[PDB]
Amino acid sequence: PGSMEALVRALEEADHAVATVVQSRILEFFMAAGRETPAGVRGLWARALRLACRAYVETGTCEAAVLAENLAGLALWRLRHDWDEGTAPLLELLGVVNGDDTTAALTEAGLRTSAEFGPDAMFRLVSEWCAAFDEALAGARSADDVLAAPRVVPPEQTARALVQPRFATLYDMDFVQDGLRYVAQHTNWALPLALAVRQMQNEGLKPLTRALFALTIADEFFHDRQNPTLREQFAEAARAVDEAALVPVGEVNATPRTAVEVRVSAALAHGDAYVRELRPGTVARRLRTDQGVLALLDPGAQAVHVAAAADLDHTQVDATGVWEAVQASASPLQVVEALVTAGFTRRHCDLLERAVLDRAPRLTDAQRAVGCTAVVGGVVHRLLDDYGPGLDYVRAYTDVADTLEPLYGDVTAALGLPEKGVEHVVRHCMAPRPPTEHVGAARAALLREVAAAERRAGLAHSAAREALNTWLAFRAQSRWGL
Numbered sequence: 001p002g003s004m005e006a007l008v009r010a011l012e013e014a015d016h017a018v019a020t021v022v023q024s025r026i027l028e029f030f031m032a033a034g035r036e037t038p039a040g041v042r043g044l045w046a047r048a049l050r051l052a053c054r055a056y057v058e059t060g061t062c063e064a065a066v067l068a069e070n071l072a073g074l075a076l077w078r079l080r081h082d083w084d085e086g087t088a089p090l091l092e093l094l095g096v097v098n099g100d101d102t103t104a105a106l107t108e109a110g111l112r113t114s115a116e117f118g119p120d121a122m123f124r125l126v127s128e129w130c131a132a133f134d135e136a137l138a139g140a141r142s143a144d145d146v147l148a149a150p151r152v153v154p155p156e157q158t159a160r161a162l163v164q165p166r167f168a169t170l171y172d173m174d175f176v177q178d179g180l181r182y183v184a185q186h187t188n189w190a191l192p193l194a195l196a197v198r199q200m201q202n203e204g205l206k207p208l209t210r211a212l213f214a215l216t217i218a219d220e221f222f223h224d225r226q227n228p229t230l231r232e233q234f235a236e237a238a239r240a241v242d243e244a245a246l247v248p249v250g251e252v253n254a255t256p257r258t259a260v261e262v263r264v265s266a267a268l269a270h271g272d273a274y275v276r277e278l279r280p281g282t283v284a285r286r287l288r289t290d291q292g293v294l295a296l297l298d299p300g301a302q303a304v305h306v307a308a309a310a311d312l313d314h315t316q317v318d319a320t321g322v323w324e325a326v327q328a329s330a331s332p333l334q335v336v337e338a339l340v341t342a343g344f345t346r347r348h349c350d351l352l353e354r355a356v357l358d359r360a361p362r363l364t365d366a367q368r369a370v371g372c373t374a375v376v377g378g379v380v381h382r383l384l385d386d387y388g389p390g391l392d393y394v395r396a397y398t399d400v401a402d403t404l405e406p407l408y409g410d411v412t413a414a415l416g417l418p419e420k421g422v423e424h425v426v427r428h429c430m431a432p433r434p435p436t437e438h439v440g441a442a443r444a445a446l447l448r449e450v451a452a453a454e455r456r457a458g459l460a461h462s463a464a465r466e467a468l469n470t471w472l473a474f475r476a477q478s479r480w481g482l
C-alpha cells in the first residue's frame with residue numbers, strides 16, 4: 001500500500017519493450033506519498049532493487065538509472081519507524097539494503113553502489129545516525145536518576161549530533177523527524193527537575209526555601225512514588241525552618257486555607273514530603289502570607305512560597321529581577337533556569353497567572369512583573385517537553401503560539417506589554433530553530449545524482465529531474481514552509 005509496494009507491482013506488469021510505460025511508473029514512485037515501515041521495506045527490498053536494475057538494463061533510461069542507484073535513500077525517505085523499539089529494526093533493514101545481492105545487481109546492471117542516496121552511503125550514514133540516536137538516549141532515564149545526579153543539560157545539546165551537516169541528506173526523512181520527536185519527549189522533562197534539585201541542595205539558601213523546593217519536586221516529578229533521598233532532604237530542611245515563618249496557633253485564619261497551604265502545612269507538620277492532607281482534629285500551622293514573611297525567604301526565590309506570592313492583598317513579592325532575567329533569555333536553558341531558580345515552577349506559574357490576571361485590568365507595576373513572569377513561564381513550561389531541532393517542534397510551537405491571542409490578547413495592555421508582547425517574549429527564547437538549510441542540501445545531493453545519470457544517458461534534462469524537483473518542492477513547502 002506504500003510507495004515501494006505500488007512500485008514493485010507496477011514494475012511487475014512487464015512492458016519493457018516500451019521504455020515509456022516503465023518511465024511513468026518510476027516517475028510515479030518519485031512523487032509517491034505512501035509511507036512504509038522497516039519490516040515492509042525489508043520484505044520488498046531485494047525484489048524492488050532487482051526490478052529497478054532490470055528496468056535500466058532493458059530500457060537504459062535515466063529514470064531507471066536514478067531509481068536503482070538511489071533506491072536506498074528514496075525507500076528510507078518516507079519511512080515510518082516505531083521508535084519505542086529503538087534502532088534494531090532500522091539496523092536490520094540497513095543490513096538487507098547493504099547485502100551482497102544489492103551490489104551484485106547494481107554491478108551486473110553496470111550501475112554504481114556509491115550514489116549519495118545509494119546503499120553504501122545509506123548504510124554508513126544511517127548506521128552512524130542510529131549510533132548517535134542511542135548515545136542521545138543514554139542520559140538520565142528516571143526522575144530517581146536525575147535526583148541522584150542533577151545534571152543540567154541545554155535542551156539544544158541533546159539532539160545536536162542528529163542534525164549535524166554530515167546528516168543533512170537524512171534530515172527531511174520521516175524516520176529522522178520521528179526520532180527527534182522521540183528524543184525530545186524522553187529528555188527535556190528532566191531539566192526543570194535538575195534545576196529544582198540544585199536549589200533544594202543549595203546550602204546558601206534558607207531552610208524554608210529549600211524545603212519548599214523539595215515539595216515542588218515531590219509534586220511535579222514523583223507524585224506518590226517515594227524517593228528516600230528526596231524524603232531525607234525535605235525532612236532536614238523542614239526541621240531547620242525558622243519558626244517565625246509560621247502563623248501562631250489560635251490566630252484567626254491560622255488554619256491552612258487553600259489546597260496549597262494544606263499540602264505544605266501537612267508536610268511540614270509531619271516532616272514528610274509525601275503527606276499532603278490534614279485529617280480533622282489535627283493541628284497544623286500554616287506559613288505566614290503577610291509582607292513580613294518576605295524577610296524569611298530568599299530575595300531571588302520568594303515565589304517558591306507560592307501562597308504568599310499569590311496573597312496579593314497582603315503581600316507583594318519582588319519579581320522584577322526574575323522578569324528581567326526571563327526577558328533577557330535567548331534560549332530554552334536560560335529562560336527555564338531563570339524561572340525555576342526563582343521558584344516559578346510549572347505549577348507556580350499556573351497559580352500566579354490565575355492570581356494576578358484575576359485582578360486585571362488594574363494591576364500595579366510589581367504585580368505586572370509577577371504576572372508577566374507567570375504567563376510567559378506557563379507557556380515556556382508547555383513548550384519545553386517538545387523542544388528540538390525538527391518538524392515536530394515547529395508544529396508543537398505553532399499550536400501553542402495560536403493560543404496566545406485568545407488567552408492573553410485582552411490582558412496584555414494590563415500587563416504593561418505592547419501588542420503581541422507575550423508572543424514576542426516567548427519567540428525570543430523558545431522559537432523553533434530547525435536547520436532547514438539541510439533540506440536544500442539534500443535536494444542538491446539528489447540532483448547531483450540526477451545530473452550524473454543525465455550525463456551517462458547523454459542528456460541535459462530528464463523527466464526524472466522534473467518529477468523529483470516537484471516532489472522535493474512539495475515536501476519543502478508543505479512541511480517546512482520553504
Ligand SMILES: [Ca+2]
Nearest residue numbers: 082083084085
Ligand atoms: Ca510504539
Ligand SMILES: [Ca+2]
Nearest residue numbers: 382383385386
Ligand atoms: Ca508540550
Ligand SMILES: [Cl-]
Nearest residue numbers: 215216260306
Ligand atoms: Cl508549592
Ligand SMILES: [Cl-]
Nearest residue numbers: 392395396399
Ligand atoms: Cl504536535
Ligand SMILES: [Cl-]
Nearest residue numbers: 419420421424
Ligand atoms: Cl510584530
Ligand code: NA
Nearest residue numbers: 081082083084
Ligand atoms: Na513511536
Ligand code: NA
Nearest residue numbers: 038082085089
Ligand atoms: Na518495528
Ligand code: NA
Nearest residue numbers: 039088089092
Ligand atoms: Na527481526
Ligand code: NA
Nearest residue numbers: 097098119120
Ligand atoms: Na551496500
Ligand code: NA
Nearest residue numbers: 104107108109
Ligand atoms: Na550476470
Ligand code: NA
Nearest residue numbers: 150151152153
Ligand atoms: Na550540570
Ligand code: NA
Nearest residue numbers: 202203204205
Ligand atoms: Na546552609
Ligand code: NA
Nearest residue numbers: 248249250251
Ligand atoms: Na495564638
Ligand code: NA
Nearest residue numbers: 199300301341
Ligand atoms: Na534560589
Ligand code: NA
Nearest residue numbers: 291314315316
Ligand atoms: Na504589603
Ligand code: NA
Nearest residue numbers: 381382384385
Ligand atoms: Na512541558
